[PDB]
mmCIF file with all atom_site columns, C-alpha atoms in Angstrom:
data_model
loop_
_atom_site.group_PDB
_atom_site.id
_atom_site.type_symbol
_atom_site.label_atom_id
_atom_site.label_alt_id
_atom_site.label_comp_id
_atom_site.label_asym_id
_atom_site.label_entity_id
_atom_site.label_seq_id
_atom_site.pdbx_PDB_ins_code
_atom_site.Cartn_x
_atom_site.Cartn_y
_atom_site.Cartn_z
_atom_site.occupancy
_atom_site.B_iso_or_equiv
_atom_site.pdbx_formal_charge
_atom_site.auth_seq_id
_atom_site.auth_comp_id
_atom_site.auth_asym_id
_atom_site.auth_atom_id
_atom_site.pdbx_PDB_model_num
ATOM 1   C CA . UNK H 1 1   ? 123.227 -1.053 90.224  1.00 0.00 ? 1   UNK H CA 1
ATOM 2   C CA . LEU H 1 2   ? 120.128 0.822  91.367  1.00 0.00 ? 2   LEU H CA 1
ATOM 3   C CA . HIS H 1 3   ? 122.178 4.009  91.579  1.00 0.00 ? 3   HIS H CA 1
ATOM 4   C CA . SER H 1 4   ? 125.372 5.603  90.289  1.00 0.00 ? 4   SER H CA 1
ATOM 5   C CA . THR H 1 5   ? 128.772 5.537  92.101  1.00 0.00 ? 5   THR H CA 1
ATOM 6   C CA . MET H 1 6   ? 128.665 6.357  95.811  1.00 0.00 ? 6   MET H CA 1
ATOM 7   C CA . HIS W 2 1   ? 120.232 14.827 66.177  1.00 0.00 ? 3   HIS W CA 1
ATOM 8   C CA . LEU W 2 2   ? 120.636 11.114 66.982  1.00 0.00 ? 4   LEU W CA 1
ATOM 9   C CA . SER W 2 3   ? 120.920 10.239 63.290  1.00 0.00 ? 5   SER W CA 1
ATOM 10  C CA . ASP W 2 4   ? 123.664 12.841 62.973  1.00 0.00 ? 6   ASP W CA 1
ATOM 11  C CA . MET W 2 5   ? 125.472 11.315 65.960  1.00 0.00 ? 7   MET W CA 1
ATOM 12  C CA . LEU W 2 6   ? 125.065 7.870  64.417  1.00 0.00 ? 8   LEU W CA 1
ATOM 13  C CA . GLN W 2 7   ? 126.904 9.101  61.331  1.00 0.00 ? 9   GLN W CA 1
ATOM 14  C CA . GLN W 2 8   ? 129.613 10.858 63.342  1.00 0.00 ? 10  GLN W CA 1
ATOM 15  C CA . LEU W 2 9   ? 130.241 7.561  65.136  1.00 0.00 ? 11  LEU W CA 1
ATOM 16  C CA . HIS W 2 10  ? 130.108 5.430  61.970  1.00 0.00 ? 12  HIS W CA 1
ATOM 17  C CA . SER W 2 11  ? 132.827 7.684  60.602  1.00 0.00 ? 13  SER W CA 1
ATOM 18  C CA . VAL W 2 12  ? 135.180 7.566  63.598  1.00 0.00 ? 14  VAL W CA 1
ATOM 19  C CA . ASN W 2 13  ? 134.721 3.804  63.999  1.00 0.00 ? 15  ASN W CA 1
ATOM 20  C CA . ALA W 2 14  ? 135.246 3.156  60.269  1.00 0.00 ? 16  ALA W CA 1
ATOM 21  C CA . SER W 2 15  ? 138.600 4.960  60.568  1.00 0.00 ? 17  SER W CA 1
ATOM 22  C CA . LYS W 2 16  ? 139.758 2.272  63.016  1.00 0.00 ? 18  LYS W CA 1
ATOM 23  C CA . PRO W 2 17  ? 141.300 4.940  65.337  1.00 0.00 ? 19  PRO W CA 1
ATOM 24  C CA . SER W 2 18  ? 143.304 2.486  67.440  1.00 0.00 ? 20  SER W CA 1
ATOM 25  C CA . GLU W 2 19  ? 143.962 -0.188 64.813  1.00 0.00 ? 21  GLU W CA 1
ATOM 26  C CA . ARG W 2 20  ? 147.235 1.018  63.333  1.00 0.00 ? 22  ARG W CA 1
ATOM 27  C CA . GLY W 2 21  ? 149.465 4.031  62.839  1.00 0.00 ? 23  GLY W CA 1
ATOM 28  C CA . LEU W 2 22  ? 150.977 6.178  65.580  1.00 0.00 ? 24  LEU W CA 1
ATOM 29  C CA . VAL W 2 23  ? 148.091 7.064  67.909  1.00 0.00 ? 25  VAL W CA 1
ATOM 30  C CA . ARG W 2 24  ? 148.228 10.748 68.864  1.00 0.00 ? 26  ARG W CA 1
ATOM 31  C CA . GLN W 2 25  ? 145.089 10.940 71.010  1.00 0.00 ? 27  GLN W CA 1
ATOM 32  C CA . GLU W 2 26  ? 146.225 14.166 72.720  1.00 0.00 ? 28  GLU W CA 1
ATOM 33  C CA . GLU W 2 27  ? 146.061 16.114 69.450  1.00 0.00 ? 29  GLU W CA 1
ATOM 34  C CA . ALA W 2 28  ? 142.381 15.224 69.102  1.00 0.00 ? 30  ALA W CA 1
ATOM 35  C CA . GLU W 2 29  ? 141.486 16.981 72.347  1.00 0.00 ? 31  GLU W CA 1
ATOM 36  C CA . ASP W 2 30  ? 139.349 20.075 71.956  1.00 0.00 ? 32  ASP W CA 1
ATOM 37  C CA . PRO W 2 31  ? 138.757 21.836 75.309  1.00 0.00 ? 33  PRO W CA 1
ATOM 38  C CA . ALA W 2 32  ? 136.477 24.256 73.469  1.00 0.00 ? 34  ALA W CA 1
ATOM 39  C CA . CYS W 2 33  ? 133.914 21.455 73.073  1.00 0.00 ? 35  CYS W CA 1
ATOM 40  C CA . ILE W 2 34  ? 133.557 20.920 76.819  1.00 0.00 ? 36  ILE W CA 1
ATOM 41  C CA . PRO W 2 35  ? 129.977 19.788 77.663  1.00 0.00 ? 37  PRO W CA 1
ATOM 42  C CA . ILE W 2 36  ? 127.602 22.276 79.259  1.00 0.00 ? 38  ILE W CA 1
ATOM 43  C CA . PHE W 2 37  ? 125.417 19.622 80.891  1.00 0.00 ? 39  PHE W CA 1
ATOM 44  C CA . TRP W 2 38  ? 125.779 15.958 81.777  1.00 0.00 ? 40  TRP W CA 1
ATOM 45  C CA . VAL W 2 39  ? 124.359 13.558 84.344  1.00 0.00 ? 41  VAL W CA 1
ATOM 46  C CA . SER W 2 40  ? 126.478 13.586 87.478  1.00 0.00 ? 42  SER W CA 1
ATOM 47  C CA . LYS W 2 41  ? 124.290 11.236 89.572  1.00 0.00 ? 43  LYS W CA 1
ATOM 48  C CA . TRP W 2 42  ? 121.286 8.969  89.033  1.00 0.00 ? 44  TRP W CA 1
ATOM 49  C CA . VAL W 2 43  ? 118.984 6.641  90.959  1.00 0.00 ? 45  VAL W CA 1
ATOM 50  C CA . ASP W 2 44  ? 117.104 3.808  89.274  1.00 0.00 ? 46  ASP W CA 1
ATOM 51  C CA . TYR W 2 45  ? 113.759 3.483  91.023  1.00 0.00 ? 47  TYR W CA 1
ATOM 52  C CA . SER W 2 46  ? 111.890 2.546  87.843  1.00 0.00 ? 48  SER W CA 1
ATOM 53  C CA . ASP W 2 47  ? 110.461 -0.533 89.533  1.00 0.00 ? 49  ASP W CA 1
ATOM 54  C CA . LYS W 2 48  ? 108.174 1.820  91.442  1.00 0.00 ? 50  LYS W CA 1
ATOM 55  C CA . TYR W 2 49  ? 108.496 5.438  90.302  1.00 0.00 ? 51  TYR W CA 1
ATOM 56  C CA . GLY W 2 50  ? 111.109 6.167  87.660  1.00 0.00 ? 52  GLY W CA 1
ATOM 57  C CA . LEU W 2 51  ? 114.625 7.433  87.016  1.00 0.00 ? 53  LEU W CA 1
ATOM 58  C CA . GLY W 2 52  ? 115.979 10.218 89.184  1.00 0.00 ? 54  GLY W CA 1
ATOM 59  C CA . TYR W 2 53  ? 119.086 12.151 88.216  1.00 0.00 ? 55  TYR W CA 1
ATOM 60  C CA . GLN W 2 54  ? 121.193 15.187 88.932  1.00 0.00 ? 56  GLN W CA 1
ATOM 61  C CA . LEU W 2 55  ? 122.723 17.336 86.202  1.00 0.00 ? 57  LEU W CA 1
ATOM 62  C CA . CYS W 2 56  ? 126.228 18.745 86.701  1.00 0.00 ? 58  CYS W CA 1
ATOM 63  C CA . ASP W 2 57  ? 124.770 22.164 87.609  1.00 0.00 ? 59  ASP W CA 1
ATOM 64  C CA . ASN W 2 58  ? 123.074 20.571 90.624  1.00 0.00 ? 60  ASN W CA 1
ATOM 65  C CA . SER W 2 59  ? 119.613 20.757 89.094  1.00 0.00 ? 61  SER W CA 1
ATOM 66  C CA . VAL W 2 60  ? 117.706 17.501 89.568  1.00 0.00 ? 62  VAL W CA 1
ATOM 67  C CA . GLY W 2 61  ? 115.199 15.715 87.401  1.00 0.00 ? 63  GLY W CA 1
ATOM 68  C CA . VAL W 2 62  ? 112.989 12.682 87.279  1.00 0.00 ? 64  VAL W CA 1
ATOM 69  C CA . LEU W 2 63  ? 111.552 10.816 84.331  1.00 0.00 ? 65  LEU W CA 1
ATOM 70  C CA . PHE W 2 64  ? 108.597 9.015  85.848  1.00 0.00 ? 66  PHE W CA 1
ATOM 71  C CA . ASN W 2 65  ? 107.298 5.696  84.577  1.00 0.00 ? 67  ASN W CA 1
ATOM 72  C CA . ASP W 2 66  ? 104.194 7.471  83.270  1.00 0.00 ? 68  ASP W CA 1
ATOM 73  C CA . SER W 2 67  ? 106.490 9.317  80.851  1.00 0.00 ? 69  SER W CA 1
ATOM 74  C CA . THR W 2 68  ? 106.104 12.618 82.664  1.00 0.00 ? 70  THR W CA 1
ATOM 75  C CA . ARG W 2 69  ? 109.107 14.666 83.769  1.00 0.00 ? 71  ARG W CA 1
ATOM 76  C CA . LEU W 2 70  ? 109.746 16.913 86.755  1.00 0.00 ? 72  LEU W CA 1
ATOM 77  C CA . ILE W 2 71  ? 112.775 19.198 86.823  1.00 0.00 ? 73  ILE W CA 1
ATOM 78  C CA . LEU W 2 72  ? 113.943 21.153 89.871  1.00 0.00 ? 74  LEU W CA 1
ATOM 79  C CA . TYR W 2 73  ? 116.422 23.956 89.116  1.00 0.00 ? 75  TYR W CA 1
ATOM 80  C CA . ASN W 2 74  ? 119.549 24.518 91.217  1.00 0.00 ? 76  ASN W CA 1
ATOM 81  C CA . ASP W 2 75  ? 117.856 27.339 93.156  1.00 0.00 ? 77  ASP W CA 1
ATOM 82  C CA . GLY W 2 76  ? 115.936 24.553 94.883  1.00 0.00 ? 78  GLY W CA 1
ATOM 83  C CA . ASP W 2 77  ? 112.531 26.065 94.182  1.00 0.00 ? 79  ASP W CA 1
ATOM 84  C CA . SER W 2 78  ? 111.873 26.562 90.460  1.00 0.00 ? 80  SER W CA 1
ATOM 85  C CA . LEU W 2 79  ? 110.099 23.541 88.953  1.00 0.00 ? 81  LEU W CA 1
ATOM 86  C CA . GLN W 2 80  ? 109.385 22.544 85.376  1.00 0.00 ? 82  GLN W CA 1
ATOM 87  C CA . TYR W 2 81  ? 106.856 19.807 84.675  1.00 0.00 ? 83  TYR W CA 1
ATOM 88  C CA . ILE W 2 82  ? 106.587 17.990 81.352  1.00 0.00 ? 84  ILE W CA 1
ATOM 89  C CA . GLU W 2 83  ? 103.382 16.033 80.733  1.00 0.00 ? 85  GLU W CA 1
ATOM 90  C CA . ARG W 2 84  ? 103.125 13.121 78.307  1.00 0.00 ? 86  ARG W CA 1
ATOM 91  C CA . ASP W 2 85  ? 101.736 15.336 75.536  1.00 0.00 ? 87  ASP W CA 1
ATOM 92  C CA . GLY W 2 86  ? 104.786 17.595 75.774  1.00 0.00 ? 88  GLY W CA 1
ATOM 93  C CA . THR W 2 87  ? 102.844 20.180 77.789  1.00 0.00 ? 89  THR W CA 1
ATOM 94  C CA . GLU W 2 88  ? 105.683 22.033 79.530  1.00 0.00 ? 90  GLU W CA 1
ATOM 95  C CA . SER W 2 89  ? 104.715 23.820 82.735  1.00 0.00 ? 91  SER W CA 1
ATOM 96  C CA . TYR W 2 90  ? 106.570 26.101 85.157  1.00 0.00 ? 92  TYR W CA 1
ATOM 97  C CA . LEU W 2 91  ? 106.072 26.412 88.914  1.00 0.00 ? 93  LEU W CA 1
ATOM 98  C CA . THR W 2 92  ? 107.825 26.195 92.274  1.00 0.00 ? 94  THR W CA 1
ATOM 99  C CA . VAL W 2 93  ? 108.132 23.875 95.241  1.00 0.00 ? 95  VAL W CA 1
ATOM 100 C CA . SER W 2 94  ? 106.459 26.556 97.355  1.00 0.00 ? 96  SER W CA 1
ATOM 101 C CA . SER W 2 95  ? 103.502 27.156 95.026  1.00 0.00 ? 97  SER W CA 1
ATOM 102 C CA . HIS W 2 96  ? 102.425 24.145 92.982  1.00 0.00 ? 98  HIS W CA 1
ATOM 103 C CA . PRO W 2 97  ? 99.136  22.459 92.075  1.00 0.00 ? 99  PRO W CA 1
ATOM 104 C CA . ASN W 2 98  ? 98.058  19.960 94.719  1.00 0.00 ? 100 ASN W CA 1
ATOM 105 C CA . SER W 2 99  ? 98.074  17.297 91.983  1.00 0.00 ? 101 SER W CA 1
ATOM 106 C CA . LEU W 2 100 ? 101.884 17.378 91.786  1.00 0.00 ? 102 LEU W CA 1
ATOM 107 C CA . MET W 2 101 ? 102.295 16.858 95.537  1.00 0.00 ? 103 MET W CA 1
ATOM 108 C CA . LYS W 2 102 ? 103.139 13.163 95.150  1.00 0.00 ? 104 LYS W CA 1
ATOM 109 C CA . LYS W 2 103 ? 105.641 13.717 92.343  1.00 0.00 ? 105 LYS W CA 1
ATOM 110 C CA . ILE W 2 104 ? 107.293 16.678 94.044  1.00 0.00 ? 106 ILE W CA 1
ATOM 111 C CA . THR W 2 105 ? 107.628 14.591 97.216  1.00 0.00 ? 107 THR W CA 1
ATOM 112 C CA . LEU W 2 106 ? 109.374 11.798 95.304  1.00 0.00 ? 108 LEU W CA 1
ATOM 113 C CA . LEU W 2 107 ? 111.708 14.264 93.605  1.00 0.00 ? 109 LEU W CA 1
ATOM 114 C CA . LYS W 2 108 ? 112.732 15.720 96.958  1.00 0.00 ? 110 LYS W CA 1
ATOM 115 C CA . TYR W 2 109 ? 113.408 12.220 98.236  1.00 0.00 ? 111 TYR W CA 1
ATOM 116 C CA . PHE W 2 110 ? 115.580 11.492 95.169  1.00 0.00 ? 112 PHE W CA 1
ATOM 117 C CA . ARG W 2 111 ? 117.426 14.798 95.513  1.00 0.00 ? 113 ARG W CA 1
ATOM 118 C CA . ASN W 2 112 ? 118.132 14.098 99.193  1.00 0.00 ? 114 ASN W CA 1
ATOM 119 C CA . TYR W 2 113 ? 119.481 10.627 98.546  1.00 0.00 ? 115 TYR W CA 1
ATOM 120 C CA . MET W 2 114 ? 121.669 11.735 95.655  1.00 0.00 ? 116 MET W CA 1
ATOM 121 C CA . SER W 2 115 ? 123.109 14.798 97.406  1.00 0.00 ? 117 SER W CA 1
ATOM 122 C CA . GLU W 2 116 ? 123.955 12.799 100.510 1.00 0.00 ? 118 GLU W CA 1
ATOM 123 C CA . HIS W 2 117 ? 125.209 9.468  99.192  1.00 0.00 ? 119 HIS W CA 1
ATOM 124 C CA . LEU W 2 118 ? 126.340 9.667  95.568  1.00 0.00 ? 120 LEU W CA 1
ATOM 125 C CA . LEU W 2 119 ? 129.486 11.042 93.951  1.00 0.00 ? 121 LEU W CA 1
ATOM 126 C CA . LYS W 2 120 ? 129.164 13.862 91.460  1.00 0.00 ? 122 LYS W CA 1
ATOM 127 C CA . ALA W 2 121 ? 130.618 12.636 88.169  1.00 0.00 ? 123 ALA W CA 1
ATOM 128 C CA . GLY W 2 122 ? 132.772 15.382 86.633  1.00 0.00 ? 124 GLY W CA 1
ATOM 129 C CA . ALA W 2 123 ? 133.011 17.155 89.996  1.00 0.00 ? 125 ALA W CA 1
ATOM 130 C CA . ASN W 2 124 ? 136.426 18.488 88.999  1.00 0.00 ? 126 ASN W CA 1
ATOM 131 C CA . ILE W 2 125 ? 134.982 20.274 85.959  1.00 0.00 ? 127 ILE W CA 1
ATOM 132 C CA . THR W 2 126 ? 133.321 23.609 85.256  1.00 0.00 ? 128 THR W CA 1
ATOM 133 C CA . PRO W 2 127 ? 130.755 23.089 82.445  1.00 0.00 ? 129 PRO W CA 1
ATOM 134 C CA . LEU W 2 128 ? 118.052 23.362 80.839  1.00 0.00 ? 138 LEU W CA 1
ATOM 135 C CA . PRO W 2 129 ? 117.768 19.914 79.226  1.00 0.00 ? 139 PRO W CA 1
ATOM 136 C CA . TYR W 2 130 ? 115.573 17.133 80.550  1.00 0.00 ? 140 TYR W CA 1
ATOM 137 C CA . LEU W 2 131 ? 115.944 13.367 80.248  1.00 0.00 ? 141 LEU W CA 1
ATOM 138 C CA . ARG W 2 132 ? 114.254 12.384 76.990  1.00 0.00 ? 142 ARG W CA 1
ATOM 139 C CA . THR W 2 133 ? 114.778 8.656  77.435  1.00 0.00 ? 143 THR W CA 1
ATOM 140 C CA . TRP W 2 134 ? 117.072 6.102  79.007  1.00 0.00 ? 144 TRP W CA 1
ATOM 141 C CA . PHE W 2 135 ? 117.795 2.399  79.182  1.00 0.00 ? 145 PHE W CA 1
ATOM 142 C CA . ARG W 2 136 ? 120.325 0.121  80.778  1.00 0.00 ? 146 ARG W CA 1
ATOM 143 C CA . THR W 2 137 ? 122.241 -2.908 79.572  1.00 0.00 ? 147 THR W CA 1
ATOM 144 C CA . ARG W 2 138 ? 124.284 -5.352 81.622  1.00 0.00 ? 148 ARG W CA 1
ATOM 145 C CA . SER W 2 139 ? 127.346 -3.124 81.230  1.00 0.00 ? 149 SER W CA 1
ATOM 146 C CA . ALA W 2 140 ? 125.960 0.408  81.044  1.00 0.00 ? 150 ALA W CA 1
ATOM 147 C CA . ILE W 2 141 ? 123.198 2.923  81.526  1.00 0.00 ? 151 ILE W CA 1
ATOM 148 C CA . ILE W 2 142 ? 122.408 5.104  78.509  1.00 0.00 ? 152 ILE W CA 1
ATOM 149 C CA . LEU W 2 143 ? 120.972 8.560  79.014  1.00 0.00 ? 153 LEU W CA 1
ATOM 150 C CA . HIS W 2 144 ? 119.572 10.657 76.194  1.00 0.00 ? 154 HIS W CA 1
ATOM 151 C CA . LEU W 2 145 ? 119.109 14.324 77.000  1.00 0.00 ? 155 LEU W CA 1
ATOM 152 C CA . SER W 2 146 ? 116.658 16.644 75.243  1.00 0.00 ? 156 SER W CA 1
ATOM 153 C CA . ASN W 2 147 ? 119.548 18.792 73.992  1.00 0.00 ? 157 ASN W CA 1
ATOM 154 C CA . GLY W 2 148 ? 120.626 15.826 71.872  1.00 0.00 ? 158 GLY W CA 1
ATOM 155 C CA . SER W 2 149 ? 123.520 14.748 74.080  1.00 0.00 ? 159 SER W CA 1
ATOM 156 C CA . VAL W 2 150 ? 123.870 11.044 74.859  1.00 0.00 ? 160 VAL W CA 1
ATOM 157 C CA . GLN W 2 151 ? 125.634 9.880  77.975  1.00 0.00 ? 161 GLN W CA 1
ATOM 158 C CA . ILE W 2 152 ? 126.906 6.339  78.533  1.00 0.00 ? 162 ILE W CA 1
ATOM 159 C CA . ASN W 2 153 ? 128.117 5.240  81.968  1.00 0.00 ? 163 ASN W CA 1
ATOM 160 C CA . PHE W 2 154 ? 129.970 1.924  82.127  1.00 0.00 ? 164 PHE W CA 1
ATOM 161 C CA . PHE W 2 155 ? 129.205 0.129  85.380  1.00 0.00 ? 165 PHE W CA 1
ATOM 162 C CA . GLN W 2 156 ? 132.318 -2.031 85.822  1.00 0.00 ? 166 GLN W CA 1
ATOM 163 C CA . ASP W 2 157 ? 135.195 0.392  85.273  1.00 0.00 ? 167 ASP W CA 1
ATOM 164 C CA . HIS W 2 158 ? 133.226 3.614  85.942  1.00 0.00 ? 168 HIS W CA 1
ATOM 165 C CA . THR W 2 159 ? 134.303 5.162  82.640  1.00 0.00 ? 169 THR W CA 1
ATOM 166 C CA . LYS W 2 160 ? 131.837 7.482  80.896  1.00 0.00 ? 170 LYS W CA 1
ATOM 167 C CA . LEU W 2 161 ? 131.165 8.931  77.472  1.00 0.00 ? 171 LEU W CA 1
ATOM 168 C CA . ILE W 2 162 ? 129.262 12.132 76.831  1.00 0.00 ? 172 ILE W CA 1
ATOM 169 C CA . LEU W 2 163 ? 128.387 12.513 73.163  1.00 0.00 ? 173 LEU W CA 1
ATOM 170 C CA . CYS W 2 164 ? 127.393 15.919 71.800  1.00 0.00 ? 174 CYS W CA 1
ATOM 171 C CA . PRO W 2 165 ? 126.174 15.807 68.170  1.00 0.00 ? 175 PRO W CA 1
ATOM 172 C CA . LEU W 2 166 ? 126.160 19.599 67.988  1.00 0.00 ? 176 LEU W CA 1
ATOM 173 C CA . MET W 2 167 ? 129.870 19.789 68.773  1.00 0.00 ? 177 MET W CA 1
ATOM 174 C CA . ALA W 2 168 ? 130.394 16.458 67.000  1.00 0.00 ? 178 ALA W CA 1
ATOM 175 C CA . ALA W 2 169 ? 132.504 15.717 70.044  1.00 0.00 ? 179 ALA W CA 1
ATOM 176 C CA . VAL W 2 170 ? 132.890 13.187 72.813  1.00 0.00 ? 180 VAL W CA 1
ATOM 177 C CA . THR W 2 171 ? 133.974 13.679 76.374  1.00 0.00 ? 181 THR W CA 1
ATOM 178 C CA . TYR W 2 172 ? 135.587 10.603 77.905  1.00 0.00 ? 182 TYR W CA 1
ATOM 179 C CA . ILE W 2 173 ? 136.033 10.150 81.652  1.00 0.00 ? 183 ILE W CA 1
ATOM 180 C CA . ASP W 2 174 ? 138.505 7.337  82.378  1.00 0.00 ? 184 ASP W CA 1
ATOM 181 C CA . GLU W 2 175 ? 138.784 5.182  85.499  1.00 0.00 ? 185 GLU W CA 1
ATOM 182 C CA . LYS W 2 176 ? 141.225 7.670  87.051  1.00 0.00 ? 186 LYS W CA 1
ATOM 183 C CA . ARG W 2 177 ? 138.370 10.140 86.588  1.00 0.00 ? 187 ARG W CA 1
ATOM 184 C CA . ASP W 2 178 ? 140.306 12.260 84.110  1.00 0.00 ? 188 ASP W CA 1
ATOM 185 C CA . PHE W 2 179 ? 138.073 14.498 81.973  1.00 0.00 ? 189 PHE W CA 1
ATOM 186 C CA . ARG W 2 180 ? 139.013 14.831 78.292  1.00 0.00 ? 190 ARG W CA 1
ATOM 187 C CA . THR W 2 181 ? 136.855 16.169 75.438  1.00 0.00 ? 191 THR W CA 1
ATOM 188 C CA . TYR W 2 182 ? 137.700 15.155 71.866  1.00 0.00 ? 192 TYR W CA 1
ATOM 189 C CA . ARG W 2 183 ? 136.382 16.205 68.498  1.00 0.00 ? 193 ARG W CA 1
ATOM 190 C CA . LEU W 2 184 ? 135.280 13.060 66.660  1.00 0.00 ? 194 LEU W CA 1
ATOM 191 C CA . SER W 2 185 ? 136.721 14.201 63.333  1.00 0.00 ? 195 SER W CA 1
ATOM 192 C CA . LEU W 2 186 ? 140.144 14.674 64.946  1.00 0.00 ? 196 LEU W CA 1
ATOM 193 C CA . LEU W 2 187 ? 139.966 11.202 66.488  1.00 0.00 ? 197 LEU W CA 1
ATOM 194 C CA . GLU W 2 188 ? 139.701 9.928  62.930  1.00 0.00 ? 198 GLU W CA 1
ATOM 195 C CA . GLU W 2 189 ? 142.695 12.107 62.117  1.00 0.00 ? 199 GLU W CA 1
ATOM 196 C CA . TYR W 2 190 ? 144.936 11.223 65.041  1.00 0.00 ? 200 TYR W CA 1
ATOM 197 C CA . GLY W 2 191 ? 143.473 8.018  66.417  1.00 0.00 ? 201 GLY W CA 1
ATOM 198 C CA . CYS W 2 192 ? 142.946 6.939  70.011  1.00 0.00 ? 202 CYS W CA 1
ATOM 199 C CA . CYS W 2 193 ? 143.706 4.215  72.551  1.00 0.00 ? 203 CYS W CA 1
ATOM 200 C CA . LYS W 2 194 ? 142.066 0.787  72.413  1.00 0.00 ? 204 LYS W CA 1
ATOM 201 C CA . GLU W 2 195 ? 139.948 1.771  75.428  1.00 0.00 ? 205 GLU W CA 1
ATOM 202 C CA . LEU W 2 196 ? 138.191 4.774  73.907  1.00 0.00 ? 206 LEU W CA 1
ATOM 203 C CA . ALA W 2 197 ? 137.963 3.046  70.516  1.00 0.00 ? 207 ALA W CA 1
ATOM 204 C CA . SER W 2 198 ? 136.130 0.134  72.096  1.00 0.00 ? 208 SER W CA 1
ATOM 205 C CA . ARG W 2 199 ? 133.679 2.388  73.910  1.00 0.00 ? 209 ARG W CA 1
ATOM 206 C CA . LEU W 2 200 ? 132.985 4.355  70.743  1.00 0.00 ? 210 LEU W CA 1
ATOM 207 C CA . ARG W 2 201 ? 132.088 1.099  69.011  1.00 0.00 ? 211 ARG W CA 1
ATOM 208 C CA . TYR W 2 202 ? 129.750 0.348  71.910  1.00 0.00 ? 212 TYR W CA 1
ATOM 209 C CA . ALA W 2 203 ? 128.425 3.915  71.672  1.00 0.00 ? 213 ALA W CA 1
ATOM 210 C CA . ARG W 2 204 ? 127.373 3.333  68.055  1.00 0.00 ? 214 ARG W CA 1
ATOM 211 C CA . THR W 2 205 ? 125.459 0.197  69.040  1.00 0.00 ? 215 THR W CA 1
ATOM 212 C CA . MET W 2 206 ? 123.713 2.143  71.815  1.00 0.00 ? 216 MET W CA 1
ATOM 213 C CA . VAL W 2 207 ? 122.893 5.069  69.538  1.00 0.00 ? 217 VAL W CA 1
ATOM 214 C CA . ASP W 2 208 ? 121.345 2.600  67.077  1.00 0.00 ? 218 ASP W CA 1
ATOM 215 C CA . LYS W 2 209 ? 119.369 1.069  69.937  1.00 0.00 ? 219 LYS W CA 1
ATOM 216 C CA . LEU W 2 210 ? 118.005 4.523  70.858  1.00 0.00 ? 220 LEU W CA 1
ATOM 217 C CA . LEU W 2 211 ? 116.917 5.037  67.246  1.00 0.00 ? 221 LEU W CA 1
ATOM 218 C CA . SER W 2 212 ? 115.011 1.744  67.033  1.00 0.00 ? 222 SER W CA 1
ATOM 219 C CA . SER W 2 213 ? 113.436 2.062  70.499  1.00 0.00 ? 223 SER W CA 1
ATOM 220 C CA . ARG W 2 214 ? 112.048 5.595  70.288  1.00 0.00 ? 224 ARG W CA 1
ATOM 221 C CA . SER W 2 215 ? 108.411 6.656  69.945  1.00 0.00 ? 225 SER W CA 1
#
């Protein structure tokens, strides 16, 4: 993942 | 403080907290050790710029690839810039040296994206450090804050550990997003579920990695 939880 | 954390973990893990005996995890809770800060959101743009993150107090930071750090306080204007040679510097988004224009632009972009699209981890909790270093494995992202705290976010199940060597405690956030802070010494005393035990074993491996990767 390029980012944490949406 | 990492070495101290490494020992705290070695101790809890050596006790085999989930192995045998009646596990009384609840008695190891210590709400007085609640974390002050932790990473609630992050964006991995290290392929181009660096790691952007939001602390639980809504302040945002970025650890750029050039090892410099830019921190924007929750007032949305106060900025703190940390050069490679540790040179800490204060300023604002309204009055800053033209040289930081590019980095302040990127931080604003990060802040926008995070505030609009990402969930705030620990949003149901009431709690300035900067991101010293970080790395990611196939199963987690490890964040080491300048206050000595180490945060580990597990990608698959969304569980998270927040390790504070000062408190010698660990806050665990399970898949149901429950927030529980335990004192490591008490975990040795009362034990814990297989889940937290496993993650604490992983935590030790990560802490060791941080120690042999630093510079």
